[PDB]
Structures are given as structure tokens and as C-alpha cells.
């Protein structure tokens, strides 16, 4: 259950990680060229992700409350 003190840090990081990604003017100019996204094999947009970080902050509180394993 060592993630419940790492995930609450992620929503502090969500700020700190998106800011330092957007503060780097080269991160935001490589997506939009979606041809660059499919070689890597993952998404690279991140401003819409201000709530996907929340979509996981949502369900990661759902993991350990059950802790089904």
C-alpha cells in the first residue's frame, strides 16, 4: 500500500510534471506531428491530460480500498 503516499504526490506532481513539460518548448512542438507519436507507440499530448491525471487519481483511490489481492 506504498502507493497511497506516492499518488497524492502525483497530483502535486501533476502540476510539477506538466509545468516542467510545458516549460520545455520542445515537448509541446513534437506532438501535433502525430507521425512522431506512433513510432514511440504512445500518446504525447499532455495539456488535455490535466484531467487524465485526475482520471487515475480517481481510480487509484479505488484500488487499495478493495486491495482485492
Amino acid at each position: 500500500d506504498e502507493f497511497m503516499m506516492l499518488l497524492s504526490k502525483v497530483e502535486k506532481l501533476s502540476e510539477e510534471i506538466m509545468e516542467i513539460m510545458q516549460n520545455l518548448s520542445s515537448i509541446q512542438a513534437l506532438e501535433g506531428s502525430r507521425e512522431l507519436e506512433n513510432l514511440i507507440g504512445i500518446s504525447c499530448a499532455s495539456h488535455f491530460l490535466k484531467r487524465e491525471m485526475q482520471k487515475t487519481k480517481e481510480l487509484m483511490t479505488k484500488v487499495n480500498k478493495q486491495k482485492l489481492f
Binding site: E37, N38, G41, I42
Partner: protein
């Protein structure tokens, strides 16, 4: 009714048998018929949902069953496939091209081939991580797109080999396993043969002489 129950024990003895050899089972298949009066053509649309290994997925399509005793032929008019958002854009072009070619036998043709390769990705990254668990780190689990080769001793220098299976323009399966190099410039300061640059061109011919299993355990034995 005695045998009316044995009919289910035998026609389901057929269902699993198909799900085993094909690798393709079938769950929901509704049936819909349409007559057109105006030598007489009749159209059917029916939707189907199955699954292969981990791959779950749904097919909705329509057939233009032309009827004539001189021409008993058949065709399809439009398929529409939707799948789960995976990290490989092949599965976004897997739909993007199958709709312009519209045959589903090729669909289930390459999917057997696709998941069969994907399971090589799993079993090898599980076979290396049981034989060399101190030097291999799977970036995204046993289904990761590649593999790290490093230690907690030399972190700034690793080699990541990338397992990338794809499907061509024809509609057939084409994997492609090449090399990437993670290195500090300090190590180039000493490299005098400079084989570190010609590493992918060498690696694309490294699996040639040896195969995947023998080339990679060679590249891990040369690292450690």
C-alpha cells in the same frame, strides 16, 4: 427429452474444439434478414463479438448476397471494426485499412499471426527475465514494447532493444526488431573502434546469423 440434451453436449463439444484450434471463439451472433422486391438480391447485416487471447473486439458488417442461379456469388458492402485504445497504432490502422479492403478472413488471418507474435514478445521477455533478472528491466511489463539492459551499477548506459511487430500495406504481418543505444559521451571519449554507432545496422544483422534467442543472449553476455 434424452437426446435433446446430448445434442447440446455434442454441439458444444464442437464449440470449444473450434475455439482451441482456431484460437477464435464466438459468443454473440444475432441474425437479421432483409428482402427487397422490385434476379433477386437479398441483404443481411449481423453483428458479432469474439476474442483472441487478450484481444477483445467487435465486428459489425453487412453482406450483399446477390442471388441468381447463373451467378450464385456474394460480396460485402461495409465493415466497421472498433477495438480498445492500445499503444500500438497498428491497431488504429488495423481498422483504418480493413474498411477499404473489407474482407474479414484476412482480418482473422493476421490476428492469429499478430497475437502469435505478441506472445513471443511475452514469453521471451519472461524467459530473459528468469535467466538474467539482474540485467533486464521490462519498461512496461511482460507486454512492453522493448527491454532495458542495464544494472543499478551503470544506469547512465544501457541498451534497449525494441520488439516492434506490425502489419504491412498488403494486410500481412511484418515484425521489425532493431536496436537503440543509450550512452554517455564519456564512453565515446574512449571508444576507438566506434562500433557503438553502427549498432542498429549491426543489430539488424545480429539476429540474422543467430536468431532472436541467440543474438540477444549474446548481446547480454557481451554486456555483463
Amino acid at each position: 427429452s434424452k437426446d435433446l440434451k446430448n445434442q447440446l453436449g455434442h454441439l458444444e463439444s464442437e464449440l470449444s474444439f473450434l475455439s482451441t484450434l482456431t484460437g477464435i471463439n464466438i459468443r454473440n451472433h444475432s441474425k437479421q434478414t432483409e428482402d427487397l422486391t422490385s434476379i433477386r438480391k437479398v441483404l443481411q447485416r449481423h453483428r458479432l463479438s469474439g476474442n483472441c487471447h487478450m484481444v477483445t473486439f467487435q465486428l459489425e458488417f453487412q453482406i450483399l448476397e446477390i442471388q441468381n442461379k447463373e451467378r450464385l456469388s456474394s460480396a460485402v458492402t461495409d465493415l466497421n471494426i472498433i477495438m480498445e485504445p492500445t499503444e500500438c497504432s497498428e491497431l488504429s490502422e488495423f481498422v483504418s485499412r480493413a474498411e477499404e479492403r473489407k474482407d474479414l478472413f484476412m482480418f482473422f488471418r493476421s490476428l492469429h499471426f499478430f497475437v502469435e507474435w505478441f506472445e513471443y514478445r511475452k514469453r521471451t521477455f519472461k524467459h530473459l527475465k528468469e535467466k538474467y533478472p539482474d540485467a533486464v528491466y521490462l519498461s512496461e511489463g511482460p507486454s512492453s514494447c522493448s527491454m532495458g539492459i542495464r544494472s543499478a551499477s551503470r544506469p547512465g548506459f544501457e541498451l534497449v532493444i525494441v520488439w516492434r511487430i506490425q502489419i504491412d500495406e498488403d494486410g500481412k504481418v511484418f515484425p521489425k526488431l532493431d536496436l537503440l543505444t543509450k550512452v554517455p559521451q564519456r564512453a565515446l571519449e574512449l571508444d576507438k573502434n566506434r562500433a557503438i554507432e553502427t549498432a542498429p545496422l549491426s543489430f539488424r544483422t545480429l539476429v540474422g546469423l543467430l536468431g532472436i534467442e541467440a543474438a540477444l543472449e549474446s548481446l547480454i553476455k557481451s554486456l555483463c
